[PDB]
Ligand binder design. Structure first.
Ligand SMILES: Oc1ccccc1-c1cc2c(nn1)NC[C@@H]1CNCCN21
Ligand SMILES: Oc1ccccc1-c1cc2c(nn1)NC[C@@H]1CNCCN21
Ligand SMILES: [Zn+2]
Ligand SMILES: [Zn+2]
Ligand SMILES: [Zn+2]
Lengths: 115, 115, 115
């Protein structure tokens, strides 16, 4: 469980980059509303219903500071992001929809760079 | 007797760049599964009944490393893939349809590219 | 009312150099064609159509001659570059698409250093 190689760090990023920077057919960068969560004092409901919240920043941070040991351990936090999103949003609502798409992007992006 | 110049580089790239990025009515890029083959370990059965397999990766290799003389060289690789993808996968099975869908997309991209 | 600290000037160049330096997934420097405008004699067109023409050399030249006052003054010009590309070049035409990409990189460079 000793120094996170640079090679592994080099992946996590580009993966989470591939994701963040993804722009759809119309060209809308889907990540926009996932980067920063909204405030407890803005959307208290979210933090009532979502027991273990998360956004992208807080995933990037955890990359930056070598918390994540394997690519597995990242997927989980990206997956929990979308789970959360889906859980809070109305099926067929643009928020709800993006999370899915992104979910896939990662899995292909991770595939395309990982084992 | 001679080299492979800008027209053969740009155009043969231009063609392929286009095809890859082609997305159906659902904006679903159909190149997806045709970029990187399954490993021989992954799906032995492919190679247990396909003579001379080929990826998408290898196409851009054959481009970057100047093996395709004319257009007629490229297409042969291109159409083959589909031939395989069709040969292997089942009629109606998404991949099959995609594989065909592609064939043509190239055909237009080649014909449209009139010098 | 006062000249530009080297702290600033060295940003303008970092930000712009990130931009210019940038290559796409493929490994393709998008900047390439924007670095220098075409000759008047070569694209008389561009000059008839584009009101205030600008490429990258001149921006550099305009950082060097302490001609940009804020980062605004810069981005203002940097976007004038992409507007002009998208004004002249047809939607979906490779160039066009690229220009948009760059607009983002620039903004992600700048939004990076504003922190
Ligand atoms: O589920 C998330 C995970 C990570 C980051 C953000 C969200 C998120 C943001 C949301 C929302 N739901 N989820 N509902 C509507 C609300 C409208 N205003 C923008 C903020 N937004
Ligand atoms: O819009 C621009 C902004 C800054 C620098 C260059 C351009 C630019 C270059 C162009 C073009 N359109 N725009 N049309 C295609 C043509 C292909 N041959 C070289 C010239 N090139
Ligand atoms: Zn570190
Ligand atoms: Zn070469
Ligand atoms: Zn000076």
């Amino acid at each position: 469980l000793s120094p996170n190689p640079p090679k592994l760090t080099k992946q996590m990023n580009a993966i989470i980059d591939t994701v963040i920077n993804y722009k759809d057919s119309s060209g809308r960068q889907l990540s926009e509303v996932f980067i920063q969560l909204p405030s407890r004092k803005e959307l208290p409901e979210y933090y009532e219903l979502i027991r273990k919240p998360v956004d992208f920043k807080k995933i990037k941070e955890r990359i930056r500071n070598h918390k994540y040991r394997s690519l597995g351990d990242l997927e989980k936090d990206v997956m929990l992001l979308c789970h959360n999103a889906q859980t809070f949003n109305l099926e067929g609502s643009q928020i709800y929809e993006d999370s899915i798409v992104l979910q896939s992007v990662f899995k292909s992006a991770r595939q395309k760079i990982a084992k």
